[PDB]
Amino acid sequence: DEIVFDLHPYIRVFKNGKVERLHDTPYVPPSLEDPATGVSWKDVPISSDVSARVYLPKISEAEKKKLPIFVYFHGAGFCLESAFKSFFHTYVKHVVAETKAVGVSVEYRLAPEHPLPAAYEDCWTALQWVASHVGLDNSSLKNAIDKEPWIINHGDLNKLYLGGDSPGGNIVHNVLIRAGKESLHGGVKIRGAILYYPYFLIRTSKRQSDYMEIDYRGYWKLAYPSAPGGTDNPMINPVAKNAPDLAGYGCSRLLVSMVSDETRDITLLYLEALKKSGWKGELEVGDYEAHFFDLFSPENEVGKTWIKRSSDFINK
Amino acid sequence: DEIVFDLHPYIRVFKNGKVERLHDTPYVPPSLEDPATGVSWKDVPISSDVSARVYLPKISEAEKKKLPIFVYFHGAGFCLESAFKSFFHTYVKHVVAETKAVGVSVEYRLAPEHPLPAAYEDCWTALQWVASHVGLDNSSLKNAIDKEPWIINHGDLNKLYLGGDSPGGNIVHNVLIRAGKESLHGGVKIRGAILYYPYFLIRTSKRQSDYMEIDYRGYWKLAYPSAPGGTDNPMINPVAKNAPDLAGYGCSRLLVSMVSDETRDITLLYLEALKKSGWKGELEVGDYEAHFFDLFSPENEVGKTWIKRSSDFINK
Numbered sequence: 001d002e003i004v005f006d007l008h009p010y011i012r013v014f015k016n017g018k019v020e021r022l023h024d025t026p027y028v029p030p031s032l033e034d035p036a037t038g039v040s041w042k043d044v045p046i047s048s049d050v051s052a053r054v055y056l057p058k059i060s061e062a063e064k065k066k067l068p069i070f071v072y073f074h075g076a077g078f079c080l081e082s083a084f085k086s087f088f089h090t091y092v093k094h095v096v097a098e099t100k101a102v103g104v105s106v107e108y109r110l111a112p113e114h115p116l117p118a119a120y121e122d123c124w125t126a127l128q129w130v131a132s133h134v135g136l137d138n139s140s141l142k143n144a145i146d147k148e149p150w151i152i153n154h155g156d157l158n159k160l161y162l163g164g165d166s167p168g169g170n171i172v173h174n175v176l177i178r179a180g181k182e183s184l185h186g187g188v189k190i191r192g193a194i195l196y197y198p199y200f201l202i203r204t205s206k207r208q209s210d211y212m213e214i215d216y217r218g219y220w221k222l223a224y225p226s227a228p229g230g231t232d233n234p235m236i237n238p239v240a241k242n243a244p245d246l247a248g249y250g251c252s253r254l255l256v257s258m259v260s261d262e263t264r265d266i267t268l269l270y271l272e273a274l275k276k277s278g279w280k281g282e283l284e285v286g287d288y289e290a291h292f293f294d295l296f297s298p299e300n301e302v303g304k305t306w307i308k309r310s311s312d313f314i315n316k
Numbered sequence: 317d318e319i320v321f322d323l324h325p326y327i328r329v330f331k332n333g334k335v336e337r338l339h340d341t342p343y344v345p346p347s348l349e350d351p352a353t354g355v356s357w358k359d360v361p362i363s364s365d366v367s368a369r370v371y372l373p374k375i376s377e378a379e380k381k382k383l384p385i386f387v388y389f390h391g392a393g394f395c396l397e398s399a400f401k402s403f404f405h406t407y408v409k410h411v412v413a414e415t416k417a418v419g420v421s422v423e424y425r426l427a428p429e430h431p432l433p434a435a436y437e438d439c440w441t442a443l444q445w446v447a448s449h450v451g452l453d454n455s456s457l458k459n460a461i462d463k464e465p466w467i468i469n470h471g472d473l474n475k476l477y478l479g480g481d482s483p484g485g486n487i488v489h490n491v492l493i494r495a496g497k498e499s500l501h502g503g504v505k506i507r508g509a510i511l512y513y514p515y516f517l518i519r520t521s522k523r524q525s526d527y528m529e530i531d532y533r534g535y536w537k538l539a540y541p542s543a544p545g546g547t548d549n550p551m552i553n554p555v556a557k558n559a560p561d562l563a564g565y566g567c568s569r570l571l572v573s574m575v576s577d578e579t580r581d582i583t584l585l586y587l588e589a590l591k592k593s594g595w596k597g598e599l600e601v602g603d604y605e606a607h608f609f610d611l612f613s614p615e616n617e618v619g620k621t622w623i624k625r626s627s628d629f630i631n632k
Contacts, residue, residue: 027343029359029367029400029423030359030361030367031361031364031365031367032361032362032363032461032462033364034364035364040461040462041361042358042359042360042361043346043358043359044346044358045346045347045348045356045357045358047347047348048347048349048350048351049347051345051346051347056461084343084345107345107346138454138455141454141465141468141469142469145348145356145372145466146356147465149465150461152457153457153458
């Protein structure tokens, strides 16, 4: 009955420790050869704490080479939604259908039940599980209970991509820093990453709207209550004094995408820092006149454009 | 806002066609090597409409032969719960851990969104998908996108069992009649089936409680509104005048289990009919002094007894 934290319409926490997410989109079960898209998906165990939705597009006998692998870390606050719920599942399904990629959409542990850095560790665990397929054939499945045939048969570990939106984009950033410090299994490398609307807190020269100065900062306090340095913690402020060098990103290619709202001023400060960092790689930028939610649906022109832009990046 | 069907605390249907299931237990995601039990599970696509939770127990290098396969059809009204929700998932996890079996718990379509016979067709689709593993090795996965390595490597199709509780037991009955009329792929046969508390409507000689005469019959009207003959439809009344011969069950061994409530009088009429039918097979009966829900949890003595009884049946 008793409420300790209230964020309508997204999340409520009760005194008894119950968490309610009334806005969250519905669960969508596994499906073989979706009528609309031809895509198939399956929910696989990675650890006792981590799982993922794997996606396989419809493949023609003529299309003889393994596909790029797209590993996705969903957004929504560090505290909402699921790889298995309609919002992110439908988007990933469309990116997989357009790109012709093996998808891996990570079900990481949410705050506040599991504060950061749980999400970061879970997304690293999932990316290492993808990399662990290096050099395997179907005979590996006799003794490895956790390996995914769709990756063994249809996924090219020379074409490994990350993606994330909002806090998921923040997770991509933190995973790329870790990938520069710690090699993935078998020397697998991340070829590229797509950060859409990444969740960063950087001090703009001019005060922004109350939404940016209050609400937008509040997600970090909910996600990581004990964060050393608060909103200047390097995991949320990538240009903090003590922050890891952006030159250390463990990938060669980046697509960073923004829409025409106040977050664009923070993303521009991130891009300025990345460009000055001496990161050795190709940076591409999407800069759209649109609302954030529009880009997830191909039912919108800008969504069709964005999903095609993602496909063109992964397939370059 | 507007309610057309009300069954507290289980299910409410709105004028706008929305269905609310407020009592349903929580979703439990895929997990590798569950700390409590050692079991692993994974949600796999079978068709555009059907999926299943597959289970693998912890297997020792010494345990060198493929395991029995246990295909489960959950109960709860034809209208509630999921293979992926805690109630049935936890029970199947415990049966798999005790038995040392490959589990396949079918996510069939529920009423009222999908009236019967949808559940019956979906459980047949899932059993045929299990049978479709006959003779496959790991090389099959190059060109068959839907096959499950845990069945290929660890499941013995010579040791194929069904199980179901309440309406799930009704589904086992209807699937066994179909299996007598239609061979499974590759000549695979059902070795045995476990019907716990099967949902049947048979006329007792004496009127029972109002719960049995009203509420208990109501699930059939909700599940199959247009059923020819209503509660005398052969799919719910297995001794109806026009009903398929029980001798035609497509398995050799049955365990039928009852508890000490009024459903026992209907199950006894079913068992009398099965015994008189000239079905060629071994019938075992569990007859427990207990409450229906007690047998699903090994935290109860009778639950421990029942899960061990199921294991002893599958492993005979």
